[model samples]
Target chain A: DSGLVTVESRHSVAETIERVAAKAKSMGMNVFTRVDHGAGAKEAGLGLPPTELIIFGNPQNGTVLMQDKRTIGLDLPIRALAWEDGSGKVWLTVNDPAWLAQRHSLGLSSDVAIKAMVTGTGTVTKYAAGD
Target chain B: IIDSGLVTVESRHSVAETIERVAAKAKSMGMNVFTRVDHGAGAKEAGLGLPPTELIIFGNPQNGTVLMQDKRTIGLDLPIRALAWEDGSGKVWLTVNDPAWLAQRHSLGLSSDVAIKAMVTGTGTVTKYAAGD
Candidate 1:
C-alpha cells in the first residue's frame, strides 16, 4: 500500500495529484481518498486511510528549484506520506516518479526532471516526521 | 456587510445552463468564474455510464468574509468551485469543495440556492494510463 504523497505546490497540487492518482490507479492501486486544502498548511494533506503523513519540506533550497522550472509548480517540496497499521505494520505510499514521468508523458531533460521534480536543489533536505 | 462567494444548489437543468445562470449572478456583482470538468467517477458509481459533469471555480475579488477572522491570504478568494456531474442514467453527482458542499459545510448562506454560472462541461480528458484500457 505504498501510496506516495509528495508535498505538491499550490499551482500544481490540483493537477499533480490528479495525474498521480490516475497513474497509481492505473498501476492497479486505487486511491482510497484525496483532499485539496488550499493555503491552509504547508505540510499539505491528501487524506487517505488513517495513515501517517510526514510534514516534509525545505524552503532553503526548494526556492532555488522554483527559480528554474517556473512552471515546475507541477512538482516541488517533495513530501512522502507514510504510516503504520493497527497490527504493527508499516506502509509507504509513493507516487512512482518514473510512472509519473511516463504517464504524464512530458518532454523535458533528465536534469529538468531531477532538478524540478525528484529532488529540490538542496532546499528539500529530506522527508521527516512532524507532529 | 456584503457577502460574496461561489454558491450552488440542486437544479434539474443542463449543467451548462446552470453554469451560465451562476456566472451571470456572480458577474452582476463584478465577480468571475473559472469553471471546468473535474470528475466523472460518479457516473459509473450510480450505474450511469455517461454522466455530464461540470466543475466551476469562482470567487469574489473581495472575500472579506474570511478576512474578518484575521487571515490575510488572497489565494483563498481567487476561486472556489462546485461540480455537478449528470450520469444521464437518472442520477447526477457532486464532488467535495463545490459551492454546495462548502455552503453546507459552513451553513453560511441561502439554503434553497440555485446557481446558474457559466460553468464548463466534460472531465477534460481524465484517463488511467495502464495496459489495456
Candidate 2:
C-alpha cells in the first residue's frame, strides 16, 4: 500500500548497501550518492536506526521515461533505502517502478523503460539482500 | 510546474549553481543537506550525453522521523530532494516534490498535518530563493 517494495536483508545495513552500490556499478548503472540518515540524525541530536538511502540510475533508460513525462524527474535517479528496524532486522526498500509510472501517469511509451527498471531494481535489491 | 504533485520553477542560474544555492539555503535554515548527486556527470561517466542535471537531498531529521514513525515507508522519499536541470532549449529549472502531494502519496494522517505544512512552506521558500532573480 505504500507503493514500496521491501526485501529483508540477511546482511547488515552497511554491507547490504555496499552490495547494492557494487551491484549497481557492475550493471553499468550510475550510483549517484548515498545518504546515511542515521548519521545525519545523530548530528542533529536525534536517534534513529541504521538507515541509508542510495540514489542511482541508468540515464539511458531514465531519460526515455523522462522524455515521456518530465515530472518523473522528481523520482528519477531512483532511490533505494536500507535500514535496520527496532527488531534488528535489516530491510531494503525501493519505490516500485510500476507504481512510479502510475503516480506519474506515464504513457504506454514508457512501458519498456518501466519494465527494464523493475527488472533491474529487482535484481539489484535481491542481489544486495543475499538472495 | 505541472500538476502531478511536482513544482518546478525556472532557474536563472546554471544547474550546478542552482543546486548549490538550494543546498546552502537549506543548511543555513538548519536542515541537514545530506548529499548532492550530479546526474549529468554520472551520464558523462557512462559515455552518454545528458544536459546538466543535479539533485540535492536534504531535510530536518526531527521533522522527518516524526512522519517516519507514523509510516516508515516514507523513508524512501524522505530527506527531501530538489533537482536542477537544463532543458533541451537551454532553459534551467528546479523541481521538487510537493509536500502536500507526498502526504497524500504516503497516506499520512492528521497527526502529520503540522509537519507536512512546515515542509510545504519550507520547500516553497527554499526553491523560490534558489530559482528566483
Candidate 3:
C-alpha cells in the first residue's frame, strides 16, 4: 500500500473505467466494485477532482495469500484507480502488490496473488488508455 | 450507473427483496444510499428477460474526502457500489468493493486506516444481512 504504480492514460475518466472493467472480465478476474468520487462529491454538494476506482481479483489466487496471512485481506481483491490531473492529464494507479507483501511480511505462497495483480492491472490500464 | 463489483451470496428472497434488505441494513447503520440502477430493466431494450440485476451505490463522504485529499486520484473509487444481480439459477448475490483493498489502492497510509475501518464492517454487514446468513 505504501508504493504506487502510476500509468498515464489518454482516455476520459469514464471510458477508462469502462475499459478496465471489460479488460478484467475478459481476463476472468472478478471485478468487485467501482467508486466514482466525482459523483459522490456531487451527491455531497461538494466538488472534487475526477477520479474512479475499480477493484478486481482472481479469488483462487487471492485465497492462497489470504490463507498465509489473514491480514492480507486488507489488501486483497486489488484496486485500480483512474484520475485526472489539474492540467487534464489522466492517469491510472494501482498499489504495488510486492510493496503490500513486504508490509505484511508475506512469503513465497503470495507470489501468485502479487503476479496476478501486477500483470492484471497493467493490462487493464493498457487497454483503458489505449496504449 | 455506479462503478463497483458484485459478491453473490445465496438468499431466500427475490432480487428486489434482497436489494431492499441490503439497503435497509446500510441506512440503518448510517451509511448514505446514493442511488439504484436497474440492470434488468435496461436489458429489456435488447429483448432479453435477464434475471433481476440491480445496483446500489453508497458510502461515507467524510471518510472519502479525507482519502481523496491524500490521493485525489482515488476519487474514482469513492462512494462504493453494491451490485445485486441474479443468474439464470436460483440464487441472489450482493457484490461490492472491499474497503481494505480501497484503502491500499489509495495508499492512505496507516495513519488513516481508522478512516476506512468502518467500511470493513459496513460492507461485510450489508452483504451478510442481504444474503440472510
Against the true structure, whose lDDT is highest? Answer: 2
Winner by DockQ between candidate 2 and candidate 1: 2
Ranked by TM-score from best down, the candidates are: 2, 3, 1
Native contacts conserved, per model:
0.00, 0.49, 0.17
Candidate 1 chain A: worst 10 consecutive residues by lDDT? A122-131
**How accurate locally is residue B125 in candidate 1, as Cα lDDT from 0 to 100?**
10
Off by over 4 Å in 1: A1-131, B1-9, B38-49, B64-69, B72-78, B88-133
DockQ (C-alpha based) per candidate is 0.03, 0.52, 0.11
* TM-score, structure 1 vs. true: 0.31
Better of 2 and 3 by TM-score: 2
Better of 1 and 3 by DockQ: 3
- TM-score of each prediction: 0.31, 0.87, 0.59
lDDT of each: 0.33, 0.84, 0.69
What are the per-residue Cα lDDT tens digits for candidate 1 across A33-88?
A: 33222222222322222232221223323333323322222222232333333443
Candidate 2 displacement at residue B24 in angstroms: 2.7
- TM-score: model 3 vs. ground truth: 0.59
TM-score of chain B of each: 0.45, 0.96, 0.84
Scoring only chain A, what TM-score does candidate 2 earn?
0.97
lDDT, candidate 2, at A64: 74
What ranking emerges by DockQ with the best candidate at the front? 2, 3, 1
Query: Where in model 3 is the C-alpha error above 4 Å?
Result: B1-29, B33-59, B66-70, B74-133
